[PDB]
Design a protein around this ligand. Structure first.
Ligand code: ZN
Length: 325
């Protein structure tokens, strides 16, 4: 038996119903788990500063949860709790409402010359806010699971932060993971998921990857030995490679791993094939598909690289049932 998951995003009452459309179909393909990214795109009751009526309401949200439940789909909301506080020249809700919590105050206007802004990982107000959002979203969905993001954190320990300047980037990162863990797991008893790229040494030859996005080039990877190992690592690599050497890196470290793909058809294939080289390790959980080129959630069950490959793994969950007549 295997985890088969799909990553979808939702930010409006519409995009939610689009997803609802595809849940029945996506189930029949074989999806049994839905990672649902929300960010700050829910009408928050718990913080009025981050609320706008033009995003997902409590009603639409309780329907996705309703539908996942009827279809026995493990639902896991995601809020990115450190990096990805902006995209291109739009800064997201938290940092425009709380500019004091920016890790790089006063530096990159309109986000020129950086990938994405990040929150200050040392400022306690961040955790006060984030913990409040994690509690609300896990409530409206009636779930005990949370994905905290933590991918592609390039801005951390920056000189501009009065709070983090000069500090060790890996310890700051491990500090973020461990604060989130203390709330989601220690206090709430949830299961917590995260992206794994910051835990990998890019320069390492067995576990490293080419770029500076799929693996760490800013020295955060030592945090892998400073965080609790019941955290589920979502390990994403979207290029066709003959070896995805970070799967066994995470596995031997004690983590449960969820390999993650995007586009490529073969690239997807190759990840799945290499992940299945460890099929008989239970900490090799399964697989997650992404369709980042799909911005609506319409025909998500038609995502081509998934529909082909999914039976690939569906077989381990077939369950011979025997004639009832
Ligand atoms: Zn800081």
């Amino acid at each position: 038996k295997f985890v088969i998951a799909f990553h979808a995003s939702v930010n409006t009452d519409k995009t939610g119903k689009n997803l609802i459309k595809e849940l029945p179909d996506l189930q029949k393909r074989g999806i049994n788990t839905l990672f649902l990214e929300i960010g700050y795109n829910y009408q928050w009751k718990s913080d009025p500063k981050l609320y706008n009526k033009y995003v997902l309401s409590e009603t639409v949200a309780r329907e996705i949860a309703a539908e996942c439940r009827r279809l026995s789909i493990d639902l896991i909301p995601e809020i990115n709790c450190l990096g990805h506080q902006s995209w291109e020249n739009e800064t997201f809700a938290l940092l425009k409402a709380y500019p004091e919590l920016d890790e790089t105050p006063g530096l990159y206007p309109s986000n020129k010359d950086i990938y994405c802004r990040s929150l200050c990982s040392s400022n306690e107000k961040v955790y006060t806010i984030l913990f409040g959002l994690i509690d609300e979203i896990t409530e409206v969905f009636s779930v005990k699971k949370i994905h905290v993001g933590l991918d592609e954190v390039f801005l951390i320990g920056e000189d501009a932060c009065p709070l983090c300047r000069g500090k060790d980037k890996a310890e700051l990162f491990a500090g973020a993971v461990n604060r989130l863990y203390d709330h989601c797991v220690k206090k709430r008893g949830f299961t917590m998921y995260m992206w794994g790229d910051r835990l990998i040494d890019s320069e390492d030859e067995d576990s490293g990857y080419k770029g500076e996005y799929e693996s760490s080039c800013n020295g955060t990877y030592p945090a892998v030995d400073l965080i609790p190992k019941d955290i589920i690592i979502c390990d994403w690599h979207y290029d066709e490679l003959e070896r995805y050497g970070s799967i066994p890196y995470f596995l031997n470290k004690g983590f449960r791993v969820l390999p993650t793909s995007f586009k490529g058809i073969k690239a997807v294939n190759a990840l799945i094939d290499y992940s299945l080289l460890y099929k008989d390790n239970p900490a090799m959980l399964g697989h997650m598909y992404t369709a980042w080129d799909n911005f609506t959630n319409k025909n998500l069950s038609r995502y081509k690289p998934m529909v082909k490959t999914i039976d690939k793994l569906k077989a381990g969950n077939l369950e011979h049932h025997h004639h009832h007549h």
